[PDB]
Coordinates of C-alpha atoms in Angstrom, one line a residue:
X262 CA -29.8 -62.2 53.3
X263 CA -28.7 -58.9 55.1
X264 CA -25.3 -56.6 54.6
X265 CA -24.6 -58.2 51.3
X266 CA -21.5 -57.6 50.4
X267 CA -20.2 -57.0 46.3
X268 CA -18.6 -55.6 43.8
X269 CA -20.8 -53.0 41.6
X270 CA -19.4 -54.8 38.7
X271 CA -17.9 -57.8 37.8
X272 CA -15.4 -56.1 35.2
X273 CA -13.9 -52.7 35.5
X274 CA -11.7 -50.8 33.0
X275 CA -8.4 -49.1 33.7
X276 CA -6.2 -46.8 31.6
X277 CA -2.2 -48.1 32.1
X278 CA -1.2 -44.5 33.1
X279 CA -3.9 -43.5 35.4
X280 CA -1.4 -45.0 38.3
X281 CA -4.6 -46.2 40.4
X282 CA -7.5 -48.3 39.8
X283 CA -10.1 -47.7 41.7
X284 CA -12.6 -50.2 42.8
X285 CA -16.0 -50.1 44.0
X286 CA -17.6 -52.5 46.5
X287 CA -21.1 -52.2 47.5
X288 CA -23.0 -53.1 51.2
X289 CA -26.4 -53.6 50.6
X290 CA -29.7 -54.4 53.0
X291 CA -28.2 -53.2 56.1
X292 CA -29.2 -55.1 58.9
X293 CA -27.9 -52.0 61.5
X294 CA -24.4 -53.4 62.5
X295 CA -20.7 -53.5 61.0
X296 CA -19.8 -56.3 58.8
X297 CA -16.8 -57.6 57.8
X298 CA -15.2 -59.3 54.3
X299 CA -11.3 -59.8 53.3
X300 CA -10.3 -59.0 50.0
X301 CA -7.1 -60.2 47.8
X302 CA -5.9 -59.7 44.3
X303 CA -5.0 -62.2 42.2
X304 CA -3.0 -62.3 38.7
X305 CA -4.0 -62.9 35.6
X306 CA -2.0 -61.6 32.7
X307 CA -1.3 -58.8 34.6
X308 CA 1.1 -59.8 37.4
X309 CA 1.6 -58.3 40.7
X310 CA 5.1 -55.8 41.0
X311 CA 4.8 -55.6 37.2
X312 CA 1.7 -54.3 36.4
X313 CA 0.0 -53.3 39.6
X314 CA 0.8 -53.7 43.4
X315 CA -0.6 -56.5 44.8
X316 CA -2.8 -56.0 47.6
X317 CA -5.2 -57.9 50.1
X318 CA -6.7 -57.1 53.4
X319 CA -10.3 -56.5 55.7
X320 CA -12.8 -54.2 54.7
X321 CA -14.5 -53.2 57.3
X322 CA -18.4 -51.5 57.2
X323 CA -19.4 -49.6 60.4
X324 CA -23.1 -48.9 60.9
X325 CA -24.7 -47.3 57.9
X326 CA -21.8 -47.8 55.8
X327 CA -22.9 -48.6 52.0
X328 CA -20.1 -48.6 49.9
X329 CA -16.0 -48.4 49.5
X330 CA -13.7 -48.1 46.9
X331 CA -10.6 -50.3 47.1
X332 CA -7.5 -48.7 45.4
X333 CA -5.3 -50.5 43.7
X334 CA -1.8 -49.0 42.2
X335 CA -0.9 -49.6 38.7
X336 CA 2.7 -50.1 37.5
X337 CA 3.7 -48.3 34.3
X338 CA 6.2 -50.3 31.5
X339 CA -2.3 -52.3 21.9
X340 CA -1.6 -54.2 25.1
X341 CA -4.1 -55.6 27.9
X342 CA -3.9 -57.3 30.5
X343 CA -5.8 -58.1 33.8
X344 CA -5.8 -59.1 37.2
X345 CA -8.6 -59.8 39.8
X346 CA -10.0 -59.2 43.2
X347 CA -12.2 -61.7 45.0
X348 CA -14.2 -61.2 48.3
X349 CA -14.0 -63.9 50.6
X350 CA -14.7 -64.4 54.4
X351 CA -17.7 -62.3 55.4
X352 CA -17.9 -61.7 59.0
X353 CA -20.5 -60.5 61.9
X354 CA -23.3 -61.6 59.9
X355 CA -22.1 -60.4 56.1
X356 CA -23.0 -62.3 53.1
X357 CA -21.3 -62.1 50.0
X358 CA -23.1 -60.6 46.7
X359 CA -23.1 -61.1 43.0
X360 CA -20.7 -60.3 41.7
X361 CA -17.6 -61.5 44.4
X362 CA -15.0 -61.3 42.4
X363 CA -14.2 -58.9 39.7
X364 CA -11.6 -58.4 36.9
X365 CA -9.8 -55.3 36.1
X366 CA -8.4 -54.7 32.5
X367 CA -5.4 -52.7 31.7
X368 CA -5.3 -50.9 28.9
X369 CA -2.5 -48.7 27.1
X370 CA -3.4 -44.8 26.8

């Protein structure tokens, strides 16, 4: 497979008051052209407008493109809690990686 598309990592950690996580995803054997995947959070114990922002959309890789970083925005209040991100729907020839969906932990400072 060509423009394989992933997260680095399928768990990332976050402090509470750092405002954003931020998110890497990772394009890798490029085949030459753009490629395409959507992208969505989902809750988990951490729930969208309480804990972070809920977002989902395209990324979008132009030629020679190899990574991004999504950013999500964290909410303020020994807690944790987490939400997730999933790749779906790869486009103009993408394939999705391992991992394709990641979790991000919230921690307290």
């Amino acid at each position: 497979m060509r423009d394989v598309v992933s997260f680095e990592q399928p768990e990332f950690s976050v402090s509470r008051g750092d405002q954003v996580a931020r998110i890497p995803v990772i394009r890798r054997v490029l085949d030459g052209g753009k490629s395409q995947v959507s992208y969505r959070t989902q809750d988990g114990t951490a729930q969208g407008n309480r804990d972070y922002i809920p977002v989902e959309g395209e990324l979008l890789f132009q030629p020679g493109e190899a990574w991004k970083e999504l950013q999500v925005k964290l909410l303020e209040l020994r807690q944790v809690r987490r939400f997730h991100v999933q790749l779906s729907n790869p486009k103009f020839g993408a394939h999705l990686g391992q991992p394709h969906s990641t979790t991000i932990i919230i921690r307290d400072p």
